[PDB]
Structures are given as C-alpha cells and as structure tokens.
UniProtKB/TrEMBL annotation:
Reactions catalysed according to its record: (6S)-5,6,7,8-tetrahydrofolate + NADP(+) = 7,8-dihydrofolate + NADPH + H(+)
UniProt-recorded name of the protein: Dihydrofolate reductase
Organism: Escherichia coli
InterPro entries reported in the protein's UniProt record: DHFR (IPR012259), DHFR-like_dom_sf (IPR024072), DHFR_CS (IPR017925), DHFR_dom (IPR001796)
Gene (UniProt): folA
UniProt-annotated binding residues for NADP(+): 7, 13-17, 42-44, 61-62, 74, 93-100
Record keywords: Calcium, Metal-binding, NADP, Nucleotide-binding, One-carbon metabolism, Oxidoreductase
Presence of the UniProt keyword Transmembrane in the record: no
Keyword Transmembrane among record annotations: no
Sequence positions that bind substrate: 5, 25, 50, 55, 111
Amino-acid positions noted as binding Ca(2+) 1 in the UniProt annotation, renumbered to this chain: 114, 147
Length: 157
C-alpha cells in the first residue's frame, strides 16, 4: 500500500527553499516513516544529504545513481518492486514524484503549514470525491515552531 507524506504551505505549495522551523513536523514525519521504505526524487535525496536511517531509501531518477548508500531505480514500477513485501510504502516527494504515485496511493499524510511561500511547485490537486479526511490535529505556532501547522491523514474513497 502506497502512502504519500508531504508538508504543504498555503495553496499547496511544496517547498524543497526551507521556509519554516517545525521540529514537531519533523517528529511527525519520523514517526510516520520509521522502519518503512521511502521513495524520493533526486533533488529530495540531495537535500536530505544522507540516507534516512532505519529505512530502505529508494531514489527514482532517470539518470544513473551516484551514491551506493541508497537504491536507484528508473520507473514507478521498479521503485515499488524494490520495496519488497512491506505493509506500507512512503513516498516523500518532491512534486513530480508525488504526481507519479498519487493514482496508486491509498493514504495521504499532510502537514498544512500557514506560511506564504513563493515556490511554484504544488502538491497535486487531490479532490474530495477521491479523498476522505480521517484525522486532523491543529497546532498553534509556539516558541519552538515558527508557523501554525495542522496534521491531516486522508484515505482514498
Ligand atoms: N510532513 C513532512 N515534513 C517534511 O519536512 C517533509 N520533508 C520531505 C522531504 N524532505 C526531507 C528533508 C529532511 C528529512 C530529515 O532530515 N528527516 C529526519 C528527521 C530528523 C533528522 O534530521 O534526523 C528523519 O530521520 O526522518 C526528511 C525529509 C518530504 N515529506 C515531508 N513531510
Ligand atoms: Mn527540483
Ligand atoms: Mn497565512
Ligand atoms: Mn467513491
């Protein structure tokens, strides 16, 4: 089962380009991806800098791999197969990779951040008749979190 996990600014802007400081969102991301395979695009891999620990890291790119610490694939179907038989595969972006996996996804984990950010890459426009919000948790900005944030889980319907 494929899930997407993303942090979205106002108007669904993604944002590689690091507009906020949300330690609570990083903990949410870690909690929801721990011990699951993660699929990412190459610019997201370069941003992270080093493999996410305790997780098979799969990079989807059309060009040959340049780091033996991660697994490199060239297609969606190869990326899924490289995950093996796990209960849940986590797709961690960026925008093009989210579009590649959205039609197969059954679950979205979204953090909505009340930040206006000039990026031009948007999360795909998921519609109500395909996606039922099943969990939401709102937080105000505080001394350790720069902006308000809202954790949402949606399930395909
Ligand atoms: N909700 C959410 N928040 C994000 O920041 C996020 N980021 C990406 C991809 N970008 C990144 C960038 C850094 C790390 C990262 O360094 N994660 C660490 C957290 C603490 C640490 O640095 O060790 C991890 O272990 O998961 C993950 C994803 C994709 N979906 C997201 N989804
Ligand atoms: Mn890019
Ligand atoms: Mn605002
Ligand atoms: Mn339906």
């Amino acid at each position: 089962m494929i899930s997407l996990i993303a942090a979205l600014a106002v108007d669904r802007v993604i944002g590689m380009a690091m507009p906020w400081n949300l330690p609570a969102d990083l903990a949410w991301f870690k909690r929801n991806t721990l011990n699951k395979p993660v699929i990412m695009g190459r610019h997201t891999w370069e941003s992270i800098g080093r493999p996410l620990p305790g997780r098979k890291n799969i990079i989807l790119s059309s060009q040959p791999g340049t780091d033996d610490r991660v697994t490199w694939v060239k297609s969606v179907d190869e990326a899924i197969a490289a995950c093996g038989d796990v209960p849940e595969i986590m797709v961690i972006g960026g925008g093009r990779v989210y579009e590649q996996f959205l039609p197969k996804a059954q679950k979205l984990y979204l953090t909505h951040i009340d930040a206006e950010v000039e990026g031009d890459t948007h999360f795909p426009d998921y519609e109500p008749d395909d996606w039922e919000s099943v969990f939401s948790e709102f937080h105000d900005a505080d001394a350790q979190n720069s902006h308000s944030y809202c954790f949402e889980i949606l399930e395909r319907r």
